[PDB]
Ligand binder design. Structure first.
Ligand SMILES: [Mg+2]
Ligand SMILES: [Mg+2]
Ligand SMILES: [Mg+2]
Ligand SMILES: [Mg+2]
Ligand SMILES: [Mg+2]
Ligand SMILES: [Mg+2]
Ligand SMILES: [Mg+2]
Ligand SMILES: [Mg+2]
Ligand SMILES: [Mg+2]
Ligand SMILES: [Mg+2]
Ligand SMILES: [Mg+2]
Ligand SMILES: [Mg+2]
Ligand SMILES: [Mg+2]
Ligand SMILES: [Mg+2]
Ligand SMILES: [Mg+2]
Ligand SMILES: [Mg+2]
Ligand SMILES: [Mg+2]
Ligand SMILES: [Mg+2]
Ligand SMILES: [Mg+2]
Ligand SMILES: [Mg+2]
Ligand SMILES: [Mg+2]
Ligand SMILES: [Mg+2]
Ligand SMILES: [Mg+2]
Ligand SMILES: [Mg+2]
Ligand SMILES: [Mg+2]
Ligand SMILES: [Mg+2]
Ligand SMILES: [Mg+2]
Ligand SMILES: [Mg+2]
Ligand SMILES: [Mg+2]
Ligand SMILES: [Mg+2]
Ligand SMILES: [Mg+2]
Ligand SMILES: [Mg+2]
Ligand SMILES: [Mg+2]
Ligand SMILES: [Mg+2]
Ligand SMILES: [Mg+2]
Ligand SMILES: [Mg+2]
Ligand SMILES: [Mg+2]
Ligand SMILES: [Mg+2]
Ligand SMILES: [Mg+2]
Ligand SMILES: [Mg+2]
Lengths: 114, 155, 68
RNA sequence: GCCCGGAUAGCUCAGGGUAGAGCAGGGGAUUGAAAAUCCCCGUGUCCUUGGUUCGAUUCCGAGUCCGGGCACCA
RNA sequence: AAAAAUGUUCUAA
RNA sequence: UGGGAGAGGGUGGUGGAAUUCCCGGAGUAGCGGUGAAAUGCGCAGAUACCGGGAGGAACGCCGAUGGCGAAGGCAGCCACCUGGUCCACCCGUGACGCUGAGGCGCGAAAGCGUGGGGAGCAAACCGGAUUAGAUACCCGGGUAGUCCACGCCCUAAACGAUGCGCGCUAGGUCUCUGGGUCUCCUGGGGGCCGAAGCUAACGCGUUAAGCGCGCCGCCUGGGGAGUACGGCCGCAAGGC
């Protein structure tokens, strides 16, 4: 068991996957818009990301997880709702940092993204 | 309406209880303009509720109405090309009107013969949170709780 | 508030001047524009190149994350 | 011929003191619709028979039927 | 941020 | 002569982000995807997170309405080699100039040959949806190819649809880059708005599409047709 950890919000226009780790980044537990029975387009909504975050923290706090540094990736509409949910869960959200991957003009995107 | 809103029509308080809520209700009982018929039905039902479970019926009537007011209901929206079930709260006006509508509506579902018995028995059940108009209101509130995912599409 | 003001006289090619140069990078590691830098056209090209060098020598970041 | 298994709602599949979930069914909200979605609703001797326990889906014994398995075949 | 194809010939008064 | 700006070109090297893959950890019921789906992927441990490794391509911010080039075209950073160009001084030569049929060289992408390389992407192709159909659009895969070297191809909305050079005919405004005496004056570019004038009009307007001269290329109604025949080029495709 551990007390402090990190909370990761991978969140695209498709879904929002929250995994709580430990100080070493090793996952303590995880959740997403699929762990709450949404399948399909719904998995990408703000409410889906809220329940996903609440199911993330309520699973991690159930391990003694008290303090989380919030690392945020992606740009999907469930992004802000996830951060809000983490401060309302009961966790001592000690930080929020946006670590969204951005290339320095590297690999050619799919046609969908050019 | 396109230009300005609709100005809500104020009704004359009914001559027995002095209540505009009773009036709107009697208007929901009324068909083809036969108001006095609908007046007798609401009032002959008012007697019965003063009998069966002796209580001030206006207080029972307002518990039925209160326990039928839906606080939320789905509505269809648009964005791109969709027609969702958007959970939107109900305006206090539409709150009251859906109750009055479903009250009479579900009361007329009931199987007893004469109307005032149907009206009285639903208002007795609905004042205790049972019967048709409740199972409809609750059901509406259930569907909105379900589509809380499409709540971000609320205006 | 522009950076050319917030600093005295400096050499736009000392790629080893971390204390001078880092003032020209946002909180998120990016080379500031002239609207922040305050350098001219010709000055801005010189600064960026010498910034770019210092990144290669590990003196400046290529990118930092964003804190709230 | 023996070992390992199943049998529970219409179809699948979950399981000492509940009889379950999903999909097919029905009304309903939805839409130009075909759907996806959202609500509720049904559908049991838990194969049968005897016992265990205060009581049986469960446990056991038996068989009834159907699965898997292996060996044999004069 | 776009569901859905088509309109026989001559005459356009 | 002394200077300046620049993604101008060629060669060698080299940095970080990012994606894919592999390995180890940790962790669990989904992920991904769309309008919604499905295909796909996932209890054989995926996705999401951390650490390690490999390899390829492209260079975020700077970055611009910017710069350079004859055009195509050129963008991390370092060095080497090389071109053009601009300015100052007014020092040298003495009309040595302009253009330019042929010729020669250069020439985006795609394509072709021989090797190599192959992360991502993606003609073809397969699958999923959509649809009356869907040999499409959307989704999951995916081989050329995209990348390198060398050799070919020589095409284009190769565009400013505006050949090159010179001279002449208001200014205002913005910008790049030199020089000055640094208000500002002056060069050389890049745009805008506009005098006169031009224009069928749109518009052009010292970056002319104005006024002139020189030379070149080209047009002569549409379709047939950039086809046929001939000829030349090319491995072919196909070009002229
Ligand atoms: Mg999704
Ligand atoms: Mg130096
Ligand atoms: Mg036997
Ligand atoms: Mg069955
Ligand atoms: Mg069989
Ligand atoms: Mg459309
Ligand atoms: Mg036809
Ligand atoms: Mg010189
Ligand atoms: Mg692993
Ligand atoms: Mg599968
Ligand atoms: Mg297992
Ligand atoms: Mg599985
Ligand atoms: Mg490799
Ligand atoms: Mg002289
Ligand atoms: Mg002389
Ligand atoms: Mg070529
Ligand atoms: Mg090529
Ligand atoms: Mg090749
Ligand atoms: Mg692909
Ligand atoms: Mg198909
Ligand atoms: Mg297809
Ligand atoms: Mg078909
Ligand atoms: Mg594809
Ligand atoms: Mg391939
Ligand atoms: Mg080549
Ligand atoms: Mg152009
Ligand atoms: Mg031409
Ligand atoms: Mg010419
Ligand atoms: Mg130029
Ligand atoms: Mg100028
Ligand atoms: Mg004029
Ligand atoms: Mg003329
Ligand atoms: Mg006109
Ligand atoms: Mg005009
Ligand atoms: Mg003009
Ligand atoms: Mg001018
Ligand atoms: Mg012709
Ligand atoms: Mg030909
Ligand atoms: Mg041709
Ligand atoms: Mg021929």
């Amino acid at each position: 068991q551990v007390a402090s950890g990190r909370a990761y919000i991978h969140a695209s226009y498709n879904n929002t996957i929250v995994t709580i780790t430990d100080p070493d980044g090793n996952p303590i537990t995880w959740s997403s818009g699929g762990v709450i029975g949404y399948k399909g387009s719904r998995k990408g909504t703000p409410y889906a990301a809220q329940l996903a975050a609440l199911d993330a923290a309520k699973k991690a706090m159930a391990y003694g997880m008290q303090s989380v540094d919030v690392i945020v990736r992606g740009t999907g509409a469930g992004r802000e709702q996830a951060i809000r949910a983490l401060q309302a869960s009961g966790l001592q959200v000690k930080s929020i940092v946006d670590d969204t991957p951005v290339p320095h003009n590297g690999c050619r995107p799919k046609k969908k993204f050019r | 309406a396109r230009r300005r809103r609709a100005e809500v029509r104020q009704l004359q308080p009914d001559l027995v209880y002095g209540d505009v809520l009773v009036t709107a209700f009697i208007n929901k009982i009324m068909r083809d303009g036969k108001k006095n018929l609908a007046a007798r039905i609401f009032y002959d039902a008012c007697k019965i509720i003063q009998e069966k479970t002796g209580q001030e019926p206006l207080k029972v009537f307002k518990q039925a109405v209160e326990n039928v007011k839906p606080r939320m209901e789905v509505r269809s929206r648009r964005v791109g090309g969709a027609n969702y079930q958007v959970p939107m709260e109900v305006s206090p006006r539409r709150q009251q009107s859906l109750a009055l509508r479903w009250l009479v509506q579900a009361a007329n579902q009931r199987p007893e013969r004469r109307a005032a018995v149907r009206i009285a028995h639903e208002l007795m059940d609905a004042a205790e949170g049972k019967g048709g108009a409740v199972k409809k209101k609750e059901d509406v509130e259930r569907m909105a709780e379900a589509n809380r995912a499409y709540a971000h599409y609320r205006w | 508030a522009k950076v050319k003001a917030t600093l005295g006289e400096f050499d736009l090619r000392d790629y080893r001047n971390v204390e001078v140069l880092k003032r020209f990078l946002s909180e998120t590691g990016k080379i500031l524009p002239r609207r922040r830098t305050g350098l001219s056209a010709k000055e801005q090209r010189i600064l960026a190149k010498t910034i770019k060098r210092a990144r290669i020598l590990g003196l400046l970041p290529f990118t930092e994350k964003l804190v709230r």
